[PDB]
C-alpha cells in the first residue's frame, strides 16, 4: 500500500474539505475563535512575516479521512506548498490533534510592502487544488 500511495496521483483537491477566502484585516482576530486558538501561537513569535502580510486570507479545510487514507501530513503539505510557491505565500496550519485540519494561506509580504489582491488569491486557490501535486 505504501507503493500504491507513492504512485497514485494526489492533488490538494483530493484531500480538501473546502476553501474559503476572508478579508481578514487583523491577523490576530482572524475570522472566529476556532482559528484564534492556534493562530496566535504562530503569531506569538512569528518569523519571515513580521515585516508585512497580505490582507486577504485563504483558509483551507482538509478532510481527515482523505488525509488518513493517503497518510498525508500537514507539515509535508505546507512544505510542498512552500516548495511550489517558495516565499510567495505564507502557510499556517493547525496541529493534527484538532478535530478540524486548517491551513491559512496569504501572499508574500514584499508584494504587500497588479491584477488584484483578491482575484490573484482565487487563481492560486484553483491552481493549488488541481495543478499542485502532493
Amino acid at each position: 500500500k505504501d507503493i500504491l500511495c507513492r504512485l497514485e496521483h494526489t492533488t490538494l483537491r483530493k484531500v480538501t474539505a473546502n476553501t474559503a477566502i476572508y478579508y481578514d484585516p487583523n491577523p490576530q482576530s482572524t475570522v472566529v475563535a476556532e482559528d484564534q486558538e492556534w493562530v496566535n501561537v504562530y503569531y506569538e513569535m512569528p518569523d519571515f512575516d513580521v515585516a508585512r502580510i497580505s490582507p486577504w486570507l485563504l483558509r483551507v479545510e482538509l478532510d481527515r479521512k482523505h488525509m488518513t487514507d493517503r497518510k498525508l501530513t500537514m507539515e509535508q503539505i505546507a512544505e510542498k506548498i512552500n516548495a511550489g510557491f517558495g516565499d510567495d505565500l505564507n502557510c499556517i496550519f493547525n496541529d493534527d490533534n484538532a478535530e478540524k485540519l486548517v491551513l491559512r494561506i496569504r501572499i508574500m509580504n514584499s508584494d504587500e510592502n497588479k491584477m488584484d489582491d483578491d482575484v490573484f488569491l482565487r487563481c492560486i486557490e484553483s491552481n493549488m487544488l488541481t495543478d499542485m501535486t502532493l
Partner: protein
C-alpha cells in the same frame, strides 16, 4: 367586537364610457420604488423608433430622478378582463377596464461604454484584468 363579525356589502357600478382611459403601471418589487420622493413625474412616448404602437418612457424628477421605460404587455386578455375598484363616498364600487398593461423598468444613469469603444475592450476577451479599472478609464 363588531370587527369579529363585521359584514359589509357594497354595490357595483360599471359606467358605459369614461373620458379617461385606465391603464396599469407595474414596477418590480425589488426595484424598491418610493412614491414619496416623486416630487415631479414626466411620462412621454419614447423616440427610439423615430406613437400609440410604441413603448412608453417614464421620467421622474427630470434627469435627477430615476428613469423608467414602459413596455406594453405582449399577452392579450381576449379571454380575461381586469378591473379596478375605487372607494367612493357613495360606497358603491366602480369597475373600470384596463386599456393596456405596461411594465416599467428603471434605466441606469452612468457613463456607459459606447459600441465603438466596446469593440476595443473585446480584444481583451478573457485577458481582462482588474474589472474595476475598466470604468476608471471611462
Amino acid at each position: 367586537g363588531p370587527s369579529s363579525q363585521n359584514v359589509t356589502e357594497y354595490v357595483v357600478r360599471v359606467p358605459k364610457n369614461t373620458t379617461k382611459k385606465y391603464n396599469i403601471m407595474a414596477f418590480n418589487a425589488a426595484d424598491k420604488v418610493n412614491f414619496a420622493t416623486w416630487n415631479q413625474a414626466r411620462l412621454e412616448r419614447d423616440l427610439s423608433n423615430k406613437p400609440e404602437d410604441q413603448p412608453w418612457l417614464l421620467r421622474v424628477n427630470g434627469k435627477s430622478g430615476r428613469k423608467f421605460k414602459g413596455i406594453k404587455k405582449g399577452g392579450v386578455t381576449e379571454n380575461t378582463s381586469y378591473y379596478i375598484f375605487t372607494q367612493c363616498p357613495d360606497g358603491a364600487f366602480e369597475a373600470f377596464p384596463v386599456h393596456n398593461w405596461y411594465n416599467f423598468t428603471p434605466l441606469a444613469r452612468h457613463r456607459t461604454l459606447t459600441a465603438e469603444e466596446a469593440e476595443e475592450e473585446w480584444e481583451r476577451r478573457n485577458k481582462v484584468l482588474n474589472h474595476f479599472s475598466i470604468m476608471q478609464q471611462r
